[PDB]
Tab-separated table of C-alpha atoms and ligand atoms in Angstrom:
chain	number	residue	atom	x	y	z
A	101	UNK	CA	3.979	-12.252	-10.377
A	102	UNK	CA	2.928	-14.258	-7.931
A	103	UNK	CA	1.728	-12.497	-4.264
A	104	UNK	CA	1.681	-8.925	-1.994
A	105	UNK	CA	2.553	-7.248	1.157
A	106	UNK	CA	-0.032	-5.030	2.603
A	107	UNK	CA	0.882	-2.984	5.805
A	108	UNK	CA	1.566	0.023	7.422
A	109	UNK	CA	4.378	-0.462	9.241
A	110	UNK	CA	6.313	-4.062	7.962
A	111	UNK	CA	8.723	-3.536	10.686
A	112	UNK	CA	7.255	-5.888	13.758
A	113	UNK	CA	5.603	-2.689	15.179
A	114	UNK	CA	1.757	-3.279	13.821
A	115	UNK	CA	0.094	-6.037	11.811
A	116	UNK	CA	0.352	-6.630	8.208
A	117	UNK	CA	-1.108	-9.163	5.484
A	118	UNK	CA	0.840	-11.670	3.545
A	119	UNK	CA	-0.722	-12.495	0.710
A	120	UNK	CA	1.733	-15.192	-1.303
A	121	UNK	CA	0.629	-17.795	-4.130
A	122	UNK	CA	3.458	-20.345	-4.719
A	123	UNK	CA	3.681	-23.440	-6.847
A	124	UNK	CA	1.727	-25.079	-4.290
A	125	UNK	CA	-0.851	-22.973	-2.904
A	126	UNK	CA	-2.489	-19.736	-2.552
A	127	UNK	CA	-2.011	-18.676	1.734
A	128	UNK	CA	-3.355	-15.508	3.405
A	129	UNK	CA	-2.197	-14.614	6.707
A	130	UNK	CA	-2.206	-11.635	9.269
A	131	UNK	CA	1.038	-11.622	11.841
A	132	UNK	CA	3.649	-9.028	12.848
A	133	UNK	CA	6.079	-9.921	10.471
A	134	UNK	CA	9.766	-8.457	10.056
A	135	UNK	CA	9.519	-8.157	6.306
A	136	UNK	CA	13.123	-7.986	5.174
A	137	UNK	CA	14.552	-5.103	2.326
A	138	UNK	CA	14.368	-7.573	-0.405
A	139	UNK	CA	11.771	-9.874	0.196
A	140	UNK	CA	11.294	-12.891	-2.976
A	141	UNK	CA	11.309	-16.404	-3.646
A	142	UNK	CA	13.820	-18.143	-5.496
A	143	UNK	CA	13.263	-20.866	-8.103
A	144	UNK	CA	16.416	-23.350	-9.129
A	145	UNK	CA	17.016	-22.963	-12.975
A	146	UNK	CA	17.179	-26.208	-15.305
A	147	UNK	CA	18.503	-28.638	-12.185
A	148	UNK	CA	19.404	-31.475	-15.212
A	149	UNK	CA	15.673	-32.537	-14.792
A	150	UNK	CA	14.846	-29.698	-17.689
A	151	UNK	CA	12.174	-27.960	-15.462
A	152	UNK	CA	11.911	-25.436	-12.483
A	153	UNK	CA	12.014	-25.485	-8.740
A	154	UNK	CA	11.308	-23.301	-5.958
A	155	UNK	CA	13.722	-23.185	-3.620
A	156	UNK	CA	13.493	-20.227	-1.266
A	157	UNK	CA	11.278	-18.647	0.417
A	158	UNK	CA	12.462	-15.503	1.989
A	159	UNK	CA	9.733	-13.088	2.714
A	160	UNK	CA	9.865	-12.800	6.381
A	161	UNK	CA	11.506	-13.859	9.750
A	162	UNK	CA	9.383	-14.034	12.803
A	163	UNK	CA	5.675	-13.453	13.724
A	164	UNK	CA	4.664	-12.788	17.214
A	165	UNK	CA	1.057	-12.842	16.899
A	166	UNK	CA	-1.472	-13.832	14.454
A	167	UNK	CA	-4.672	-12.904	13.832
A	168	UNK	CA	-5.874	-14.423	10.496
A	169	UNK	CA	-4.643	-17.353	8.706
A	170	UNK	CA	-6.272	-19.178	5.287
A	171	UNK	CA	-4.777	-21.744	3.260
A	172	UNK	CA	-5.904	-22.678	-0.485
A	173	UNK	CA	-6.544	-26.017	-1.602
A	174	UNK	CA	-2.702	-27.479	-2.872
A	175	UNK	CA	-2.670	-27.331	-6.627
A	176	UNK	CA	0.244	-27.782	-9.532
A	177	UNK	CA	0.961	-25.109	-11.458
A	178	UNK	CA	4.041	-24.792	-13.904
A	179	UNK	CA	7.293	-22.834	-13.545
A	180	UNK	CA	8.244	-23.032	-17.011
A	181	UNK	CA	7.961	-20.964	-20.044
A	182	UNK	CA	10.335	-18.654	-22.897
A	183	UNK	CA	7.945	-16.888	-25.557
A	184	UNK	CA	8.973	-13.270	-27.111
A	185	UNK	CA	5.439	-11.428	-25.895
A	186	UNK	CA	3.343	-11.803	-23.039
A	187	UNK	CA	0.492	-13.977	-23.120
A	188	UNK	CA	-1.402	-13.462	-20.008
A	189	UNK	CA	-2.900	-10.344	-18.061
A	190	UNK	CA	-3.988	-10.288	-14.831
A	191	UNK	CA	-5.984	-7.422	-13.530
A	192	UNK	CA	-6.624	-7.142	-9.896
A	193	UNK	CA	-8.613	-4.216	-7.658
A	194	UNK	CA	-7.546	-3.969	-3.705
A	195	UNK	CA	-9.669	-1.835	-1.269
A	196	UNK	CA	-9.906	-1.225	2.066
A	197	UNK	CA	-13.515	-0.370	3.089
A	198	UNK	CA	-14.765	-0.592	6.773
A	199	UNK	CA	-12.280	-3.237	7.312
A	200	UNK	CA	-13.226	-5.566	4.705
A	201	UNK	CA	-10.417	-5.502	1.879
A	202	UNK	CA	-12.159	-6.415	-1.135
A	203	UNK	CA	-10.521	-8.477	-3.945
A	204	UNK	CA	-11.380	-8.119	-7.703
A	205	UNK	CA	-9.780	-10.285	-10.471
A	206	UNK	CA	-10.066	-11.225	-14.032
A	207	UNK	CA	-8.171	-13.097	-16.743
A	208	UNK	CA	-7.591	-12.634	-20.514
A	209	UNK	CA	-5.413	-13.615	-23.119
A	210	UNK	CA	-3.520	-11.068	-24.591
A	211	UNK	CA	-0.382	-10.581	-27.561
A	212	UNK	CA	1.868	-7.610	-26.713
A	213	UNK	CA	5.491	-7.569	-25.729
A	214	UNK	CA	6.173	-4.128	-23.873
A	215	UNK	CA	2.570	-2.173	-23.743
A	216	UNK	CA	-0.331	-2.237	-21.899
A	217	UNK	CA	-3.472	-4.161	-23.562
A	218	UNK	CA	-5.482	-1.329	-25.219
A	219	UNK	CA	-9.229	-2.420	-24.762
A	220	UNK	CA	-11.884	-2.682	-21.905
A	221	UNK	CA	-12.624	-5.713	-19.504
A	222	UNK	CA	-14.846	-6.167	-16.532
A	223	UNK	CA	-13.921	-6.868	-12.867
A	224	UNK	CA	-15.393	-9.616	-10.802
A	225	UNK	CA	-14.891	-10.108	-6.588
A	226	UNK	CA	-13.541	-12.992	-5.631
A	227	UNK	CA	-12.712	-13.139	-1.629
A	228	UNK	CA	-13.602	-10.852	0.946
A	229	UNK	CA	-10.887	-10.852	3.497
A	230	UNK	CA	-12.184	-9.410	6.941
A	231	UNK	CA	-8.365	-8.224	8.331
A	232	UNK	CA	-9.434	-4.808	9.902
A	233	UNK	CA	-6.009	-3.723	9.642
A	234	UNK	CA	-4.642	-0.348	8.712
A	235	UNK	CA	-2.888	-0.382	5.960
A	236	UNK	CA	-0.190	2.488	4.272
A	237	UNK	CA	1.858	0.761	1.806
A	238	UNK	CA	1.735	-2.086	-0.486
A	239	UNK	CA	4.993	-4.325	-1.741
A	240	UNK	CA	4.443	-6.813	-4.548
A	241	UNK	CA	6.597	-10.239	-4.792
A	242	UNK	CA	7.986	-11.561	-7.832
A	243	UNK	CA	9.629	-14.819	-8.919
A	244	UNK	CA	13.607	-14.882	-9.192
B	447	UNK	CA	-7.631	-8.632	41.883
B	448	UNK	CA	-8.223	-9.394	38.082
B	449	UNK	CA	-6.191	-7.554	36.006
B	450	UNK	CA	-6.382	-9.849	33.246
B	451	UNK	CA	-8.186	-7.908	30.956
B	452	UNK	CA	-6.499	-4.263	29.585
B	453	UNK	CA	-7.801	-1.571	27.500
B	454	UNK	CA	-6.474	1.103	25.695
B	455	UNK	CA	-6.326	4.630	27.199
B	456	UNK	CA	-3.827	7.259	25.189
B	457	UNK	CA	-3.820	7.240	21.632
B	458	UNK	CA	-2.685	9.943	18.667
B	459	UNK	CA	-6.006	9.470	16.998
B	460	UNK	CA	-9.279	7.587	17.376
B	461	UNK	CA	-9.084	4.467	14.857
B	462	UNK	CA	-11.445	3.410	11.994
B	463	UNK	CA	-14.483	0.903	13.029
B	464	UNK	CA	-13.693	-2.311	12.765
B	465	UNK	CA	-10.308	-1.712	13.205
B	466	UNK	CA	-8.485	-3.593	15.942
B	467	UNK	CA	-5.015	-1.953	17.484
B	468	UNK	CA	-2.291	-3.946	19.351
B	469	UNK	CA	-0.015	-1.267	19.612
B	470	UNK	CA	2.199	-1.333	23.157
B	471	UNK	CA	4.403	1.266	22.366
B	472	UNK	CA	4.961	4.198	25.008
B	473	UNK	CA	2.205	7.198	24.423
B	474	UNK	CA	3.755	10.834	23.958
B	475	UNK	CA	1.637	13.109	26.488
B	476	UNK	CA	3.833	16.745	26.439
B	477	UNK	CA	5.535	18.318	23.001
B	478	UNK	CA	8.561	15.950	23.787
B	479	UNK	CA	9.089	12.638	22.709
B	480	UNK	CA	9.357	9.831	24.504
B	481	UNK	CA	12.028	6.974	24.498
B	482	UNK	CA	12.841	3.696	26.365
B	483	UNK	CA	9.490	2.296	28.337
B	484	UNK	CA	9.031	5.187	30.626
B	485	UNK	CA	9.776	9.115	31.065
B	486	UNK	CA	8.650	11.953	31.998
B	487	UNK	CA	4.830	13.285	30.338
B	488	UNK	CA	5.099	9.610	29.160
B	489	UNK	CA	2.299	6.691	29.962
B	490	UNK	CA	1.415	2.853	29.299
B	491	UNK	CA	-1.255	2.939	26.449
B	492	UNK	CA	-3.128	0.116	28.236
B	493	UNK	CA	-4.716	-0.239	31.751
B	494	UNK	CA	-6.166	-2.856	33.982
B	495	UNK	CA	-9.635	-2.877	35.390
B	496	UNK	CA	-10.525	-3.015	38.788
C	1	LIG	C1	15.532	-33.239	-10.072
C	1	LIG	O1	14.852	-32.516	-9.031
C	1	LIG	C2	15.095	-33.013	-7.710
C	1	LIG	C3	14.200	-32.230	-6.778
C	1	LIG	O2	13.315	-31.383	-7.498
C	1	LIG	C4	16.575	-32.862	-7.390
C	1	LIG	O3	16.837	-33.348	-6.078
C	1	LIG	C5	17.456	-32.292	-5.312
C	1	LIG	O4	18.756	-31.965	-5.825
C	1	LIG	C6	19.403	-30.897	-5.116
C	1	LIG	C7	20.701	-30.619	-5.837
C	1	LIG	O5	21.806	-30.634	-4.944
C	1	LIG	C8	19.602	-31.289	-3.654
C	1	LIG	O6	20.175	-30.194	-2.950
C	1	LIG	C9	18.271	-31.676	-3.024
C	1	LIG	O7	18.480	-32.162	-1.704
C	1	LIG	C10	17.577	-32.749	-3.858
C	1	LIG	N1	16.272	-33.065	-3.300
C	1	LIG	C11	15.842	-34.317	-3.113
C	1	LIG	C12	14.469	-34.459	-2.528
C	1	LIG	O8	16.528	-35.291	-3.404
C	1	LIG	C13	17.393	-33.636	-8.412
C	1	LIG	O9	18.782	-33.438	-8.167
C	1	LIG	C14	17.053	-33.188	-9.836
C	1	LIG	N2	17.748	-34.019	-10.806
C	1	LIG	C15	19.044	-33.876	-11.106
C	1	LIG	C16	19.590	-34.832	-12.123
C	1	LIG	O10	19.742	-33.015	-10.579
C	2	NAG	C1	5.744	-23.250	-1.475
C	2	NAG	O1	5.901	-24.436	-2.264
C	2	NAG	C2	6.384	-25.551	-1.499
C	2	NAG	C3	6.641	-26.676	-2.474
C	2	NAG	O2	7.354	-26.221	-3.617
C	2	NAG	C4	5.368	-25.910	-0.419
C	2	NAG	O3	5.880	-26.979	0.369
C	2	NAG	C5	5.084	-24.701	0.465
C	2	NAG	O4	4.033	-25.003	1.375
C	2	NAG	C6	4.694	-23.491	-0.383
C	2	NAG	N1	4.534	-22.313	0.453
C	2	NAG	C7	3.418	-22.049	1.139
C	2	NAG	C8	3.429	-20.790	1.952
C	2	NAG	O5	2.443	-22.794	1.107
C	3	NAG	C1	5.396	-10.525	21.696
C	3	NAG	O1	6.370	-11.485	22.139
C	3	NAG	C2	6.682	-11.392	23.536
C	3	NAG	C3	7.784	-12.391	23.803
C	3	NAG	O2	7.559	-13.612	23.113
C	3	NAG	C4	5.427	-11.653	24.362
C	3	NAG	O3	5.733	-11.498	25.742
C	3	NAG	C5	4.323	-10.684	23.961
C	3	NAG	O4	3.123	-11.010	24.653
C	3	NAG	C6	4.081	-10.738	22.452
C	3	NAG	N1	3.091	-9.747	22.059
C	3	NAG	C7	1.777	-9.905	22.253
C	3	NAG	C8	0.905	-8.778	21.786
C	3	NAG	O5	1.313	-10.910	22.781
C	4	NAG	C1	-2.657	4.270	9.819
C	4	NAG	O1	-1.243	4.363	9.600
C	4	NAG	C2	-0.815	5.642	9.108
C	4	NAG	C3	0.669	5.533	8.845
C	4	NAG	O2	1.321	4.775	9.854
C	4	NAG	C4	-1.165	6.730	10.118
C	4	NAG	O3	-0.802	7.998	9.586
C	4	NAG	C5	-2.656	6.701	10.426
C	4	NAG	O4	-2.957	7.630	11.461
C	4	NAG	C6	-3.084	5.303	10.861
C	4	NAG	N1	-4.520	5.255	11.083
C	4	NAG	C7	-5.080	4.595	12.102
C	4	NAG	C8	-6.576	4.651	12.178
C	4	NAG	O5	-4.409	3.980	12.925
């Protein structure tokens, strides 16, 4: 799980906001993007080096005009991993108030394999992303 | 004659604060819909000042 779409539209008629976190960097940006019907991004599978690659990156196709555009610090993160449960969670709050979409996040460690962790956990901000965009619908990305 | 600078006259409904709008498509004015760039009951959503 590694990004979102966030528009109303996600057709080239309005603006939308790309919200992607690859195995180098978190970016944010705000174009008129012609999102695609299967939007993803591919990672090459055990390429004789006995570890992971992405490889594509096929989320959208043009952008005509852009309005807000952040990019993260490049980091390293791993694209590896086979374990019978879930380890992580990740629990994140989206909403759109007066223009300012507001970002919540937190992190535990959890054991289960196919049920949601039973138990309580607070919710700290994290970015506040001024897009003043309207948004409808929401897409999420995940890893091939 | 500047007409550099447009603003938006027709729209379906007035938009949230803060909210910024870049939509050029053709505004609906009678019951029928509108197609193409022009028509009949049909407008530009944006105008130039004088
Ligand atoms: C180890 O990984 C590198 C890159 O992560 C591989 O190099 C790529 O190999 C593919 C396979 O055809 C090519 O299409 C790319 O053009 C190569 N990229 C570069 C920069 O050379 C490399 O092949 C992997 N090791 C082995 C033994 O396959
Ligand atoms: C995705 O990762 C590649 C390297 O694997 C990097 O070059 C690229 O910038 C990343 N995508 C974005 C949007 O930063
Ligand atoms: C969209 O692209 C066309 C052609 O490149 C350009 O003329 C137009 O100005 C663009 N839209 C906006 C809002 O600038
Ligand atoms: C936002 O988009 C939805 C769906 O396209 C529409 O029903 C609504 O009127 C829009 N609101 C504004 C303020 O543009």
């Amino acid at each position: 799980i590694r990004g979102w779409i966030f528009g109303t539209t996600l057709d080239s008629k309005t603006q939308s906001l790309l919200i992607v976190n690859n195995a180098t960097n978190v970016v944010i940006k705000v174009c008129e993007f012609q999102f695609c019907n299967d939007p993803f991004l591919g990672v090459y599978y055990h390429k004789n080096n006995k570890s992971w690659m992405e490889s594509e990156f096929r989320v959208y196709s043009s952008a005509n005009n852009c309005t807000f555009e952040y990019v993260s610090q490049p980091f390293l993160m791993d694209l590896e991993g086979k374990q019978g449960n879930f380890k992580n969670l990740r629990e994140f709050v989206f909403k759109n108030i007066d223009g300012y979409f507001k970002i919540y996040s937190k992190h535990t460690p959890i054991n289960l394999v196919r049920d949601l962790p039973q138990g309580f956990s607070a919710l700290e901000p994290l970015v506040d992303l001024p897009i003043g965009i309207n948004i409808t619908r929401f897409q999420t990305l995940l890893a091939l | 004659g500047n007409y550099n600078y447009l603003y938006r006259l027709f729209r379906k409904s007035n938009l949230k604060p803060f909210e910024r709008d870049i939509s050029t498509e053709i505004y609906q004015a009678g019951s029928t819909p509108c197609n193409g760039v022009e028509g009949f009951n049909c407008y530009f959503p944006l105008q130039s000042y004088g």
